Symmetry: D3
Subunit: 59 residues, 6 copies
């Protein structure tokens, strides 16, 4: 199982690392899959590459 | 934030429901983000659509 | 440019053709790209493969 | 409904905001979905990251 | 390294298996990565989920 | 057919060109599609955006 995470810019290296850990553990546990098999991809983007109801996340 | 999960077929609806809850609570805690803005997408595929070291997961 | 569209099941083939046409015009106009080079991909999923703040869209 | 847009580097922030607004409109209108529930993701790449018949776009 | 392949429905089981193999091989060679670490996902869609210049591929 | 490739940063432009080449020939030959209709997208990311068994690639 592979997870691709789309997050807006601005997180520390530490938060991103925690995010990889905790999301992998949630998948392993929910899917009944060995943790070593899980892959996690973070896809970061600037705040104005994210649109909400027709408006840029940066508003 | 948004998560896209690529999983192989075979999980029950209630198993998929756990998966959505638990990955979402993972993202909300890691990022310090509101759980209500988390979106999760499940991309499910046949076992032979997943390749591992050059070989179908279906061996 | 390419658009990948993540939509829930339930729409007819002609509502999906309208969707391809209107997003394609939207991209060509905004980006000033020839309409002929725009590619659109529709990634359709069950309602329960879509989680909204920890809950499947189906609910 | 969510749209992920793959575009080549080079546009201004005002062109990206227009793309977000118009693509969100087209999706709301084509799918009969509330405009406020539409999410758009822009995934921008360098020209040499896009290949056409085996060659980079940048050629 | 991971590859997500978006192909239109209809290819045989043997063709998809070949596709996975040959793609995996191409990534391992070019990137100088062990073939065992390569992961390949196939995302298959109906011919009318593919839009070329504002029109369904199916036409 | 379209390929989206997820690779870690650090390859030269010439390596990325080889990668595009070689992947496109494997798809065209596996699927016997016309090589010039093959599209490739490279999505490159930092080493700490890539998680393996719960840990950043960058360790």
């Amino acid at each position: 199982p592979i997870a691709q995470l789309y997050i807006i810019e601005g997180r520390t290296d530490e938060q991103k690392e925690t995010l990889i850990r905790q999301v992998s553990e949630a998948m392993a546990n929910s899917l009944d899959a060995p943790l070593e098999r899980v892959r996690v991809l973070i896809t970061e983007m600037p705040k104005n590459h994210f649109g909400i109801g027709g408006e840029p996340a940066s508003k």
